[PDB]
């Protein structure tokens, strides 16, 4: 902030709900909590400038976990596979993903 | 969630686009302004959702409140308008061109 | 740049780091000026009152100069402080990395061929 | 007004800026923002007036336009990246959209038509609101993220506003919208070396405002609103000529007083950068600026105008409005200069 | 369904970190048939 | 990068309860009571390692306890229990305050027959401590090491050299 | 002031009401036993797990089994 | 794409002058139509039909200036045997100038124009030579 | 799935009666039937025309009472908290803020209609 | 089901196309009301419930007193709807065309990417904790009473504030 008002009165307004790791209502953690704080615990300290390049594996990850895009491109390839090899007509899709299983507790 | 953020980008980006461009009566322009309104808060609602993050929900109230004020004064302002000229004509507010 | 120094405490105007310095001397020029231009103000006050510019507002001519000299003390203080904490930054960084800035050697002026025009 | 609506009012115009820069998160940014938008209206639609009515409309549609693009950019970013504020790893269009916004907020070049007819037609102790306090806010909000701008965007947006700023002070016979436009040219400065070194773009605010503010004052003293009105001052209140002509010189930036400063020190930052170019471009078009206030100069204090009848009668009646601040701000700014290292 | 797709790592994980990640409902349910997934994302919501 | 490192569907075998949510309910007072240091390791476990694929073998041994209660149930109080569950199943919600009868029976002929003890309001939900000779997971979050700092210059605060080297200011 | 009070009574009751009730919903909390009980209820209510902790063999008060004497005993809230 | 742009420095003046006159008559052409569109947007015209005669001559006059340009740089840099010399784009410059003169009917612009447009191309020619930068970004 | 089933059920049978009130019964259309009501005489002019509303301000003070009404919705899930005095102070503050901002009006003449 | 979720998506974007084009404000107001209604589903389909239910109570609020307004002041003696004015007409049809034609192209540059309509409805809800109790929207908004009383204190002064705002506007 431009001026640390906050800091400065040792208050803290809106400082404690920033990112997605915070405290949540009864202990319910927000998706990606453990990527959020290794981030985070990783980037304080050293500046900004250094931790664009020092933390960028968390960061990657981190993205990966909130965005999930790989993990789209993942099932697409899979399932674009999938869709090719039954018109070809060379798979069959097992009794468990059909539609008859036999379900677990 | 994809395919949904990129619908409502474009929506409000059209909402904003109608607010660009006028067409004589300020009062859709208002409403212009008040659907980048609903579009913002959508936004933020699904986003919040998606990560769980219950500590952000806090937030689309308070656009919503803030929104609406300013939507209230904005209405103010077309009631003066309108008693200065009769209509809510937004050609008629040129006097301050000199 | 400075904000976010090391040790940096937010909205202190003088830390206590800054009492290691030699305090401004009272007497200084730049603290001078400060009285110069709070008698200044406080004649542009009469004469914009329509005043007797150097009679009137004796009170109010103190009042000027004293608040702008007392106002002068600390600020130049503070920007003291401001600056040594540059110049020590400066040079504990250039300390820390003798690789980036090498000191150079400075060859004499008989062995360098300064090229001559002449001005004919 | 009556005085509750006073207090609440004017407390929300100094509460909204406070907001913005005491906030951390970007949401509560946006809520000083809106507080700051909110509060100012009533204030200049006060005089209810045609001309003051269609200048709130006019603030109105702009502010609320900007507010939601910065609403955007701040869900996007927080749709991207979790959390309220920016940072580095934030996409490069959500920051060009802030910037963008922000900008219009200003009033800064293309986006500076509504800030001349609003400035022309709400009154002037309001303009000077609008032209002094009412920048703090948006400009912190850059100045926080400063280190991810966009030097290509920043740049081209000053150098636009400083050749618009020069150009249209020219034309303008209008006190007010000349102001205005001298506001526009300022703020290019501020922003042209914000990505640099924020530190001199908020001493160039300073500046400003402390130069800006006197010269308000100053046209509030007779109400003159015209070249041609305040051309009657040698008449009205001649004390004052020497100090007008010396604070206009200053916002035109001549060396001995202290309008140098700001610009000096800018050019030097911008050199240090390599900004050769758009330095020598900026130095070179504010120098229009000199000129319309120039002409101000020779209007009021260095040749006398024409005067009226009645005008005996005003000389006749006693005055009591200038200010001590006008008095302490008006030298600050026109004397400072010897003392400028410890400015910056 | 990837024997012979040419560069691919059956359980290749997609993140760096070799700590357990939950799984998300479209890789859980992403194989199986549209009467899945959709209960999976409907079942609470429309109810009961 | 990294292969994942699934569980085959072997060892995700394991004998089930396989015993309705009405029936789990009836029976969940006396089920938080006795087997409450088998669920408690399970539970450490789960939260200590965040890794399900690191708490299987414990798992599998609350499921061995469930098996154990609801076998001894089975064997004595039966019948109670029958009437108890059915009572409860009927209800909308699965309440309690609506069959106390049945449940006092119940409780009473565990009481005597298995020796049971009912917990009271205040029993199953207090933090408690466990025993066991898993090791603390060190590094749970398979953390990489934390960056190390910048460099801090440490020194004693001196005038500036030659006054505020600004252009030609004396100082 | 009786005089204004009095009126207002018969006048413009509604508002006397109005006052009235929100002076007692100001007033009431602070004075009564039973305020302190809300939040202890409240934290009484087991939403989430109880996390066991585990025993590093110096940990004196948490129980072992639930039904130990050791712990928060909820014989308040049951005689309220 | 800026590929086609950046294309104009590929080899230095006096070669590929079609390619050159063909990129600089583009960039007059996009500096023309972002005119004539804040030049409507701004002070509209009467008929429809008169906003985009507006556009075509706004835009056709700069894509004129910008070929006359590339043209007269290239064929100057080719017939004499200085590739870089700035003088060349100054010459270029000064034709732009007076065709843009010659659009608006008017001597006093031909002159005026010439200096200045002669002026902003050997600087920027300059410019490339030396290695400014312009748009730069925070180096401290 | 049962909460659309319902609703386009109800959408069906409302547009079904009116399909059949529109098909069912014989019809006779001319020009003086269609034309519009006003009380046996033609109309002095059309109902397009600006309306004043008296109460425009009362009208505006009701959007910022209804978001204050959203603001105040969460209270039954609110007191479920463990700062039960946080809560109380918050919300004693926001309804006294309410009708403080209703009294000012009031005392000003805001509800008054405007003629 | 499936395409569930991106149609209510692209009828809130035809509806905002609407509202774009602008017809008479009393068009408008209804466009809006459709348009609310359609996010009001999209954020209950997205997991929400309060908050959705909130949107559609204030916006229903709000177009009830902008009717109000528009039938004193935004009125004209020919009011003209979507269809009336030509150009809108082409131009509402123009925009559909033309979302329909954008969607097709970006699924054909990026098979997955902003638009997967190959795999749609995939990706609608992430994550759930399926045995969790206090997990509902309403409980984060409330969190304004107890952890973000900032929020509160902002909000209620704004509105106060637009009180004695609107009154003097109106004066
Ligand atoms: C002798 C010479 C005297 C000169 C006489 C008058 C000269 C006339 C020229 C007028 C313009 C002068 C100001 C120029 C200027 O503002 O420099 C830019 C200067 C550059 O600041 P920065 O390095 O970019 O960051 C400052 C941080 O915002 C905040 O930094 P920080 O958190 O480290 O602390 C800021 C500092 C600021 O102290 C000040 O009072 C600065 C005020 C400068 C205005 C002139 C005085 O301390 C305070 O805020 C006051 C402490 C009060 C509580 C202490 C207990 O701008 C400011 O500092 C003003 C920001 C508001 C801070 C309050
Ligand atoms: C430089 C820019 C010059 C702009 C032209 C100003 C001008 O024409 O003056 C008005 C002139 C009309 O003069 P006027 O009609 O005879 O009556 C005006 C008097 O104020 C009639 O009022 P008064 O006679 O009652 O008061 C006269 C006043 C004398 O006050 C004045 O009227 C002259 C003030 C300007 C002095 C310029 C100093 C130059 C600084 C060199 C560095 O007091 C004195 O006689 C001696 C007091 C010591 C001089 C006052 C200096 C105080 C301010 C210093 C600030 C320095 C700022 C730089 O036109
Ligand atoms: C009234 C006099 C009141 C009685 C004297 C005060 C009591 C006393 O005895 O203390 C003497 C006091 C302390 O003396 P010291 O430090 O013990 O002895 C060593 C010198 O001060 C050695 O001086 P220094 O090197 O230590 O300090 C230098 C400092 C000196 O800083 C200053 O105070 C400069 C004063 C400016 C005159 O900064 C400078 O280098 C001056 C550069 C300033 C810029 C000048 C050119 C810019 C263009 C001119 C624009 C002028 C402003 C606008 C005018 C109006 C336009 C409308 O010095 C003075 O009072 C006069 C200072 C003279 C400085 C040079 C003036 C030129
Ligand atoms: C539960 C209570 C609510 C129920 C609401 C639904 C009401 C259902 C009523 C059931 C009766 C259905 C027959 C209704 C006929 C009403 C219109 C009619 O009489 O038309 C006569 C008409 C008259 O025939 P016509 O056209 O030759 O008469 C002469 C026409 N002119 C005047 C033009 C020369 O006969 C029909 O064709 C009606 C067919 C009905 C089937
Ligand atoms: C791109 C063009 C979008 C539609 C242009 C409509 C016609 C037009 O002139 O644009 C400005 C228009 C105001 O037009 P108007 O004042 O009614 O006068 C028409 C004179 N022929 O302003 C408007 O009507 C607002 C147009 C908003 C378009 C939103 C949807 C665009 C979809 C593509
Ligand atoms: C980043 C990319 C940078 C691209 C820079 C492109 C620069 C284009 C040239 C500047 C546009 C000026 C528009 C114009 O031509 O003026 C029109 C109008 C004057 O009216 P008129 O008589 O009709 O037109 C005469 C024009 N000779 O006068 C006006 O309309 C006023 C225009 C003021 C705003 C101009 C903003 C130009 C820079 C935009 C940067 C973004």
């Known amino acids: 902030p431009f001026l640390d008002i906050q800091k400065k009165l040792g208050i803290s307004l809106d ?89 677990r507790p | 969630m994809p395919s949904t953020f990129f619908n409502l980008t474009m929506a409000f980006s059209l909402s904003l686009l109608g607010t660009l461009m006028f067409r004589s009566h300020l009062m859709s322009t208002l409403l212009c302004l008040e659907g980048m309104v609903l579009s913002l808060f959508i936004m933020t609602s699904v986003t919040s959702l998606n990560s769980n993050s219950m500590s952000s929900m806090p937030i689309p109230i308070t656009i919503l409140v803030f929104a609406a004020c300013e939507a209230a004064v904005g209405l103010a302002l077309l009631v003066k308008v309108s008693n200065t000229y009769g209509t809510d004509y937004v050609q008629n507010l040129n006097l301050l061109q000199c | 740049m400075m904000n976010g120094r090391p040790g940096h405490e937010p909205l202190k105007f003088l830390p206590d780091e800054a009492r290691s310095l030699p305090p401004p001397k009272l007497n200084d020029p730049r603290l001078v000026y400060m009285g110069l231009l709070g008698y200044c103000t406080g004649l542009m006050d009469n004469m914009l009152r ?38 020590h930054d400066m040079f504990g960084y250039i300390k820390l990395h003798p690789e980036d800035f090498p000191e150079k050697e400075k060859k004499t002026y008989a062995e360098i061929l300064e090229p001559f025009h002449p001005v004919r | 007004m009556n005085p509750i609506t006073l207090a609440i009012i004017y407390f929300t115009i100094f509460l909204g800026p406070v907001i913005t820069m005491s906030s951390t998160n970007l949401m509560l940014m946006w809520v000083g923002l809106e507080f700051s938008l909110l509060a100012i209206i009533p204030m200049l639609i006060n005089k209810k007036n045609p001309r003051s009515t269609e200048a709130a409309t006019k603030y109105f549609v702009t502010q609320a336009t900007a507010s939601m693009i910065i609403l955007l950019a701040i869900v996007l970013n927080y749709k991207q990246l979790g959390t309220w504020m920016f940072q580095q790893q934030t996409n490069g269009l959500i920051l060009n959209m802030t910037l963008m916004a922000l900008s219009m907020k200003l009033g800064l070049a293309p986006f500076h038509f509504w800030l001349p007819e609003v400035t022309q037609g709400i009154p002037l102790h309001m303009g000077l609101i609008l032209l002094t306090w009412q920048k703090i806010a948006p400009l912190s909000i850059l100045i926080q993220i400063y280190p991810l701008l966009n030097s290509t965007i920043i740049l081209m947006l000053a150098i636009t506003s400083i050749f618009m700023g020069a150009w249209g002070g020219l034309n303008q016979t209008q006190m007010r919208k000349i102001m205005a436009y001298s506001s526009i040219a300022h703020m290019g400065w501020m922003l042209a070396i914000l990505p640099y070194n924020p530190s001199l773009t908020l001493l160039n605010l300073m500046i400003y405002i402390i130069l800006t503010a006197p010269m308000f004052m100053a046209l509030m003293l007779n109400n003159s609103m015209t070249i041609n009105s305040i051309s009657l001052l040698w008449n009205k209140t001649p004390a004052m000529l020497t100090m007008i002509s010396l604070m206009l010189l200053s916002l035109g930036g001549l060396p001995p007083l202290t309008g140098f400063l700001p610009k000096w020190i800018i050019i030097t930052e911008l050199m240090k950068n390599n900004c050769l170019i758009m330095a020598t471009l900026m130095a070179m078009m504010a120098l229009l600026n000199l000129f319309f206030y120039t002409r101000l100069i020779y209007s009021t204090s260095l040749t006398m105008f024409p005067t009226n009848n009645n005008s005996k009668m005003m000389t006749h009646q006693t005055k009591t409005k200038p200010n001590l601040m006008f008095s302490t701000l008006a030298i600050m700014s026109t004397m400072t200069l010897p003392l400028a290292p410890q400015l910056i | 369904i990837m024997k012979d797709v040419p560069n691919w790592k059956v359980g290749e994980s997609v993140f760096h970190t070799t700590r357990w990640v939950p799984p998300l409902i479209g890789e859980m349910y992403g194989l199986r048939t549209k009467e899945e997934m959709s209960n999976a994302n409907f079942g609470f919501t429309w109810y009961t | 990068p990294g292969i994942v490192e699934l569980p085959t569907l072997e060892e995700l075998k394991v004998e089930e309860v396989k015993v309705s949510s009405a029936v789990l309910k009836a029976a969940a007072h006396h089920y938080g009571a006795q087997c409450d240091k088998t669920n408690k390791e399970f539970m450490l476990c789960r939260w200590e390692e965040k890794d399900p694929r690191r708490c299987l073998k414990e798992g599998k041994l609350v499921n061995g306890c469930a098996l154990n209660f609801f076998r001894q149930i089975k064997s004595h109080c039966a019948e109670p229990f029958t009437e108890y569950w059915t009572c409860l199943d009927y209800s909308n919600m699965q309440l309690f305050r609506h069959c106390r009868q049945q449940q006092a029976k119940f409780d009473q002929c565990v009481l005597d027959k298995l020796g049971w003890v009912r917990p009271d309001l205040g029993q199953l939900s207090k933090v408690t401590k466990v025993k066991t000779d898993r090791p603390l997971p060190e590094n749970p979050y398979h953390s990489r090491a934390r960056p190390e700092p910048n460099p801090v210059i440490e020194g004693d605060l001196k005038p500036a050299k030659h006054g505020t080297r600004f252009f030609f200011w004396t100082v | 002031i009786s005089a204004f009070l009095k009126n207002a ?72 | ?27 007059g052409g996009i500096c023309g139509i972002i005119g004539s569109a804040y030049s409507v947007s701004l002070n509209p015209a009467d008929s429809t039909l008169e906003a985009v005669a507006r556009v075509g001559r706004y835009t056709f006059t700069a894509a004129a200036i910008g070929a006359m340009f590339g043209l007269t740089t290239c064929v100057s840099a080719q017939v004499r045997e200085k590739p870089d010399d700035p003088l060349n784009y100054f010459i270029g410059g000064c034709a732009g100038g007076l065709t843009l003169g010659a659009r608006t009917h008017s001597y006093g612009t031909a002159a005026m124009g010439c200096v200045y447009m002669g002026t902003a191309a050997a600087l920027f020619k300059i410019g490339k030579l030396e290695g400014w930068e312009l748009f730069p970004t925070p180096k401290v | 799935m049962n909460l659309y089933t319902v609703i386009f059920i109800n959408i069906l049978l409302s547009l079904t009666l009116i399909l059949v009130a529109f098909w069912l019964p014989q019809m006779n259309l001319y020009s003086e039937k269609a034309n519009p009501y006003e009380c046996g005489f033609d109309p002095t002019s059309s109902a397009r025309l600006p309306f004043s509303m008296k109460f425009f301000l009362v009208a505006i003070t009701f959007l910022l009472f209804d978001l204050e009404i959203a603001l105040l919705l969460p209270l039954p899930w609110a007191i479920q908290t463990i700062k039960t005095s946080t809560m109380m102070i918050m919300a004693f503050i926001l309804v006294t803020i309410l009708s403080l901002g209703l009294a000012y009006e009031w005392t000003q003449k805001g509800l008054e209609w405007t003629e | 089901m499936n395409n569930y979720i991106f149609v209510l998506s692209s009828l809130f974007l035809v509806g905002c196309l609407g509202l774009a084009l602008k017809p008479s404000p009393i068009y408008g107001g209804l466009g809006l009301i459709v348009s609310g209604f359609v996010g009001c589903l999209m954020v209950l389909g997205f997991g929400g419930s309060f908050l959705g239910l909130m949107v559609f109570l204030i916006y229903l609020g709000g177009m009830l007193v902008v009717f109000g307004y528009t039938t004193a002041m935004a009125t004209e003696e020919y009011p003209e709807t979507w269809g009336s004015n030509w150009l809108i007409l082409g131009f509402l049809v123009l925009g559909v065309i033309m979302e329909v034609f954008l969607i097709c192209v970006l699924n054909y540059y990026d098979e997955v990417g902003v638009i997967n309509l190959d795999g749609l409805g995939d990706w609608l809800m992430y994550e759930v904790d399926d045995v969790g109790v206090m997990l509902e929207g309403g409980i984060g908004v409330a969190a304004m009473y107890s952890c973000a009383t900032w929020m509160m204190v902002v909000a209620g002064w704004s509105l106060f504030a637009g009180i004695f705002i609107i009154i003097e506007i109106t004066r």
């Not at chain 3, 009170?59 to 402080?81: D, I, P």
């Not at chain 7, 006397?16 to 909390?29: H, N, R, T």
Request: hydrophobic letters at 35%.
């Open chain 8, 1 to 27: 794409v800026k590929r086609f742009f950046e294309s104009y420095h590929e080899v230095p003046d006096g070669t590929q002058c079609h390619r050159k006159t063909y990129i600089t008559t583009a960039l």
């Open chain 3, 50 to 87: 329509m005043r007797p510019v150097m009679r009137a507002g004796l009170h109010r001519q103190l009042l000027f100069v004293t608040s702008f000299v007392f106002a002068g003390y600390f600020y130049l203080k503070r920007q003291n402080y401001l600056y040594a904490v540059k110049d």
């Open chain 1, 15 to 103: 400082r404690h709900f920033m990112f997605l790791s915070a405290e949540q209502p009864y202990k319910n953690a927000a998706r990606c909590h453990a990527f959020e704080k290794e981030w985070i615990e990783c980037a304080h300290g050293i500046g900004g400038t250094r931790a664009k390049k020092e933390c960028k594996i968390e960061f990657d990850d981190f993205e990966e976990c909130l965005l999930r895009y790989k993990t789209m491109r993942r099932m697409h390839d899979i399932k674009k596979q999938r869709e090719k090899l039954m018109k070809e007509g060379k798979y069959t899709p097992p009794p468990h993903h059909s539609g008859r299983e036999e379900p």
């Open chain 7, 9 to 80: 009574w018969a006048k413009e009751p509604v508002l006397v009401v109005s006052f009235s009730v929100w002076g007692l919903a100001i007033i009431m909390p602070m004075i009564s036993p039973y305020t302190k009980y809300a939040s202890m209820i409240n934290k009484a209510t087991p939403y989430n797990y109880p996390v066991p902790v585990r025993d590093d063999g110096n940990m004196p008060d948490v129980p072992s089994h639930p039904q130990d004497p050791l712990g928060p005993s909820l014989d308040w809230l049951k005689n309220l």
